[PDB]
Design a protein around this motif. Structure first.
Motif, PDB file in Angstrom:
ATOM      1  N   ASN A   1      39.370  20.881 -10.096  1.00 59.17           N
ATOM      2  CA  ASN A   1      39.161  22.324 -10.105  1.00 59.17           C
ATOM      3  C   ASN A   1      40.430  23.068 -10.504  1.00 59.17           C
ATOM      4  O   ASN A   1      41.529  22.749 -10.045  1.00 59.17           O
TER       5      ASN A   1
ATOM      6  N   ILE B   1      31.059  33.304 -10.907  1.00 58.62           N
ATOM      7  CA  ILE B   1      32.378  32.992 -10.370  1.00 58.62           C
ATOM      8  C   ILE B   1      32.323  31.915  -9.292  1.00 58.62           C
ATOM      9  O   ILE B   1      33.343  31.636  -8.654  1.00 58.62           O
TER      10      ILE B   1
ATOM     11  N   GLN C   1      34.312  23.555 -15.507  1.00 57.45           N
ATOM     12  CA  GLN C   1      34.963  24.252 -16.611  1.00 57.45           C
ATOM     13  C   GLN C   1      36.036  23.394 -17.265  1.00 57.45           C
ATOM     14  O   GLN C   1      36.317  23.558 -18.457  1.00 57.45           O
TER      15      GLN C   1
ATOM     16  N   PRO D   1      39.423  38.728 -13.598  1.00 51.77           N
ATOM     17  CA  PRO D   1      40.342  38.196 -12.588  1.00 51.77           C
ATOM     18  C   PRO D   1      41.640  38.988 -12.526  1.00 51.77           C
ATOM     19  O   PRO D   1      42.054  39.644 -13.485  1.00 51.77           O
TER      20      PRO D   1
ATOM     21  N   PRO E   1      32.809  28.706  -7.421  1.00 50.67           N
ATOM     22  CA  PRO E   1      33.639  27.523  -7.675  1.00 50.67           C
ATOM     23  C   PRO E   1      32.808  26.253  -7.727  1.00 50.67           C
ATOM     24  O   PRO E   1      31.785  26.119  -7.053  1.00 50.67           O
TER      25      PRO E   1
ATOM     26  N   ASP F   1      40.364  26.727 -10.691  1.00 51.89           N
ATOM     27  CA  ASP F   1      40.195  28.137 -10.373  1.00 51.89           C
ATOM     28  C   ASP F   1      41.437  28.682  -9.682  1.00 51.89           C
ATOM     29  O   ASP F   1      42.036  28.020  -8.831  1.00 51.89           O
ATOM     30  N   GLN F   2      41.824  29.898 -10.058  1.00 50.53           N
ATOM     31  CA  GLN F   2      42.981  30.565  -9.471  1.00 50.53           C
ATOM     32  C   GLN F   2      42.504  31.416  -8.302  1.00 50.53           C
ATOM     33  O   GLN F   2      41.768  32.389  -8.493  1.00 50.53           O
ATOM     34  N   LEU F   3      42.923  31.054  -7.092  1.00 46.65           N
ATOM     35  CA  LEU F   3      42.476  31.720  -5.878  1.00 46.65           C
ATOM     36  C   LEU F   3      43.577  32.527  -5.205  1.00 46.65           C
ATOM     37  O   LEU F   3      43.380  33.011  -4.088  1.00 46.65           O
TER      38      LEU F   3
ATOM     39  N   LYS G   1      35.519  34.586  -4.594  1.00 46.97           N
ATOM     40  CA  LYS G   1      35.596  33.143  -4.786  1.00 46.97           C
ATOM     41  C   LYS G   1      35.969  32.436  -3.491  1.00 46.97           C
ATOM     42  O   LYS G   1      35.426  31.371  -3.178  1.00 46.97           O
TER      43      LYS G   1
ATOM     44  N   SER H   1      45.273  27.279  -5.594  1.00 48.65           N
ATOM     45  CA  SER H   1      44.368  26.241  -6.060  1.00 48.65           C
ATOM     46  C   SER H   1      43.476  25.795  -4.915  1.00 48.65           C
ATOM     47  O   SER H   1      43.799  25.975  -3.739  1.00 48.65           O
TER      48      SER H   1
ATOM     49  N   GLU I   1      39.009  37.266  -6.683  1.00 50.83           N
ATOM     50  CA  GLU I   1      39.586  36.180  -5.895  1.00 50.83           C
ATOM     51  C   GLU I   1      39.000  36.145  -4.492  1.00 50.83           C
ATOM     52  O   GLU I   1      38.750  35.067  -3.942  1.00 50.83           O
TER      53      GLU I   1
END
Lengths: 249, 50, 57, 53, 298, 298, 46
Positions: free
Chosen positions: A181, A166, F99, E98, A168, A183-185, A134, A8, A131
């Motif tokens: 947020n 993509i 999002q 992803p 962030p 987003d999967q990092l 990002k 995260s 990933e």
């Protein structure tokens, strides 16, 4: 390994706050970045397997002594787990955290002349996965906010269509955006699929699988911190808190 | 011994006694270091020091 | 001209022919250039267009 | 006190941008003005051309 | 001296370097496994006169029950399968899917994403160069069966050099009329209709007598390691479907008639062994695309 | 030769690439549904002595209870919809909305985000190019109905080439006086007032005599896949509104008289197939903006 | 510092383009082909 496990935006920025710059810099000589080489992959082929070395491999490489090499070493540490060989930077710069270098003017490092397109090309953005791209874009946004180059960051995203999708969403000065947020990092993690002790063909894929298999061992090791079972033994200063705020955010 | 992922934990009193120190030094000596976590390791050393 | 002529030439005769062919085209264009001034028209000028306020990216 | 003229002036946009430093390897860097008196190589080359004329 | 080469061997574009790890390979294997059940469910539906076998197969593939309102698309698996196909073809295509989504989809079925269990035979004929002397005409046409038409208008017999590369294992040459062929620095045998050659042996010299043209038909066999689930009939059909559906319309890419031509062209490029592994995974992905799209047209 | 083209077909600007996923398409559909209920609930409360239906509808839409002394703006949904509309028009517009906010707002109602279950007819006439010889004048005026006024001052008859593109399905041609039109390299039929043409047939040749001006009126119909909730009347009014409140004011973009012109112009670009998908989502968002702003003017 | 010779670029070995220090940096006349061509033409003219 620890940097690759963060999944995260809050965890990634929290790790960068407590991690000094010396972790990004490597003291191993490595090799020159861009070379066409033949490596040995005996599990698949008898002949030597061609490949090209790059800066986003998991193995240390030799880096330029300029400021461009320092930023390029930071990003490679975030996306690949290892940095480059830039010695004699100095005690004052090396003791600062990675976030301080990327976001604070008091460090004494000047980075307003950096070109995001050249840095991305030197880091082989085409070879990066979702990933990895990002994570690099997070580094670019922090640098843009430090230098007042927000407009330039947006135009660079407009030129590159895949990067805009993509990108962030967080304001580098507000902590409320980081918490929201989702987003999967994560680059390494517990695998849902079948993970075997087998080699990969390319240097990047083989080195990435080493971190993935190492993380599984690290997860079951005694060094790993299990929040569910040992939350009271953690020190209060570094204990997880819902109202966790980066300084100045 | 059979499963390496399993860990061994220990909780001591606020004012440790001779039982707590004897139990702490028995675990560090006769249990695998791989079973004892780093946080548990510091907790045992703190109990001995107190 | 010898660099374009010898890039794929395999024999001396081909190298000479390539050199002569280029200068046949080159000399022909020089004639057209002089005739442009002879007629009563005005020749155009090469130019480059750049943004009025260029951006970095 | 500096002389102040009320002359109307058009707005000026720099090639360097908001950060006031040009980016490396850009088209703006190639069209930036650069010093001629301070640089010895240019101050020598221009004197030679001036003498030739 | 004139040089003639095969049209499909010219300038192979670089393939993608993403989605080629163990996690992504099992995703393609799961898609191939689950798309096969999608096609087989249609046959089971006919036997029972019920749509419940198809509903079960679609739900596993798409993570959602089919609806009569909307057209069946395949859900997240179909979107992920389409995008990875684009990335495999060209390096310029984005890697937008992803890892976490690939992670979740690969856990649906139990498979091993090992692409070196078996082998397949590819029939494209590589002719890297045909060297001919002056006053002779050489034309190379065809990929599966290469017809080389040679005519010499000179006074005497001419020698034509054939270079078939180093990757192909067996090349068979058949002539319209008997001809003579031998390796470099070897005696020339009697005229014979059919020659069996190994490209590793070296360049081959053909005597071209003055007179009627001589045409040589070439067939080649190359072995490339592929997963056990590989089916060349389904891979070839998927290649045509992807090309028609606009999955290969990217800038600065080359186009090929068949997957046979595509895999051999990248093999013969410089450092071509890197491209073969990626192209094999693309073939399995196209096999899943062919079955999934035939069951659920859009 | 002189080339004349339609004004609205010139240089379509790139559309945004954000908020085009399945999660974001659900939010646009949800906003349209909740905006429709806001209009209906206001009318029901107007025709009754109770404000409860409007309070409930606004509370769900805006996540806040209406107040007498505060302006009813729509809350977070209004802000998200306004910024999302900005992103679709231009690639240069930023993507401000997170999002998480989009996903949370999409959970307020249960509607599929399908954007291809129906179709609509758009009436713009795509005259890509009209090629005319010397001593002739050609003028193209209009978008919904295209009038081409052509004059021949030359000695003999002139052939004019009409190109209508390959996207439109049917083009109807009407002339002030009877004229001759045929496909390229085909015999020319008898003079008649009206022609029905398929633009795929090819470029069309028109014989222009030297006597009097001939004006040709063109009407075209093209079919684009749209969600079933699409309503052309509401989209056009929403398009006119969003332009007035400056939602389309961004550097280096084109401006169009109607949404019909906007969607057809982008369809004819090099990547028109990819662009129309984003424009369709924009149309539904414009439909929601029209209803929401008419119920809650600010 | 200890060194009597001070480089125009600092110890970071980076000088921003368009700044005074970069403007007065020396040029590689031999290595640059534009610079070499110009010098030869002026010499021939003299």
């Amino acid at each position: 390994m620890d940097v690759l496990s963060k999944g995260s935006l809050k965890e990634l920025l929290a790790h960068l706050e407590k991690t000094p710059l010396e972790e990004a810099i490597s003291y191993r000589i490595g090799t020159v970045p861009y070379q066409n080489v033949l490596i040995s992959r005996n599990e698949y082929y008898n002949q030597l397997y061609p490949d090209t070395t790059s800066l986003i491999d998991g193995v240390s490489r030799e880096g330029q002594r300029n400021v461009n090499g320092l930023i390029m070493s930071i990003i490679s540490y975030v996306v690949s787990g290892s940095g480059h060989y830039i010695p004699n930077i100095g005690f004052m710069l090396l003791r600062r955290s990675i976030l301080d270098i990327l976001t604070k003017h008091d460090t004494g490092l000047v980075t307003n002349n950096l070109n995001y397109g050249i840095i991305a090309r030197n880091l082989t953005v085409s070879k990066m996965n979702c990933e990895q791209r990002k994570r690099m874009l997070i580094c670019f946004k922090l640098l843009a906010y430090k230098d007042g180059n927000q407009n330039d960051y947006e135009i660079y995203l407009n030129q590159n269509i895949p990067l805009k999708q993509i990108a962030p969403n967080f304001i580098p000065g507000d902590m409320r955006t980081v918490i929201h947020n989702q987003d999967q990092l994560a680059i390494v993690g517990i695998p849902a699929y079948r993970l075997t002790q087998s080699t990969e063909l390319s240097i990047r894929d083989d080195n990435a699988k080493s971190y993935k298999l190492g993380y599984v061992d690290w997860y079951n090791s005694n060094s790993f911190l299990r929040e569910r079972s040992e939350f009271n033994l953690i020190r209060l200063k570094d204990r997880d808190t819902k109202y966790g705020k980066l300084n100045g955010w | 011994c059979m499963f390496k992922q399993f860990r061994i934990g220990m909780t001591y009193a606020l004012d440790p006694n001779i039982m707590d120190v004897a139990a702490a030094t028995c675990m560090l000596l006769f249990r695998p270091a791989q079973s004892i976590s780093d946080e548990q390791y510091r907790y045992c050393l703190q109990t001995m020091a107190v | 001209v010898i660099k374009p002529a010898a890039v794929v030439a395999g024999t001396s005769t081909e190298l000479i022919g390539n050199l002569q062919a280029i200068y046949s085209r080159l000399r022909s264009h020089s004639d057209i250039g002089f005739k442009k001034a002879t007629v009563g028209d005005v020749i155009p000028n090469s130019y480059m267009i750049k943004p009025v306020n260029s951006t970095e990216y | 006190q500096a002389y102040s003229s009320g002359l109307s002036q058009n707005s000026i946009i720099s090639l360097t941008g908001n950060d006031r430093t040009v980016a490396d390897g850009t088209f703006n860097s190639m069209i930036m003005p650069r010093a001629v008196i301070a640089n010895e190589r240019e101050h020598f080359m221009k004197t030679r051309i001036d003498k030739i004329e | 001296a004139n040089r003639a080469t095969s049209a499909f061997l010219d300038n192979p574009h670089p393939v993608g370097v993403n989605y080629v790890d163990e996690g992504s390979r099992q995703f393609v294997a799961v898609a191939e496994l689950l798309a096969s059940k999608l096609i087989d469910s249609s046959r089971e539906s006919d036997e029972s006169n019920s749509d419940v076998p198809f509903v079960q197969a679609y739900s596993k593939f798409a993570d959602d029950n089919p609806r009569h309102l909307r057209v069946k698309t395949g859900g997240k698996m179909a979107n992920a399968l389409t995008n990875v196909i684009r990335s495999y073809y060209s390096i310029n295509a984005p890697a937008i899917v992803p890892q976490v989504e690939i992670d979740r989809l690969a856990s649906k079925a139990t498979v091993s994403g090992d692409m070196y269990n078996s082998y397949a035979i590819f029939n494209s004929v590589p002719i890297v160069e045909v060297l001919s002397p002056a006053r002779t005409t050489v034309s190379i046409v065809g990929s599966d069966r290469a017809d080389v038409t040679m005519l010499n208008t000179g006074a005497g017999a001419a020698n034509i050099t054939f270079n078939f590369g180093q990757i192909a294992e067996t090349v068979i040459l058949k002539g319209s009329v008997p001809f003579q062929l031998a390796r470099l620095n070897q005696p020339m045998p009697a005229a014979r209709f059919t020659y069996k050659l190994r490209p590793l042996d070296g360049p081959f010299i053909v005597v071209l007598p003055v007179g009627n043209p001589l045409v040589i038909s070439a067939t080649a066999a190359t072995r490339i390691q592929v997963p056990l689930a590989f089916n060349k009939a389904l891979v070839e059909s998927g290649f045509q479907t992807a090309m028609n559906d606009g999955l290969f319309d990217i800038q600065n890419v080359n186009y090929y008639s068949s997957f046979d031509e595509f895999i051999i062209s990248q093999y013969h490029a410089q450092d071509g062994i890197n491209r073969v592994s990626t192209c094999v995974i693309l073939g399995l992905a196209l096999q899943a695309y062919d079955q999934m799209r035939r069951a659920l047209p859009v």
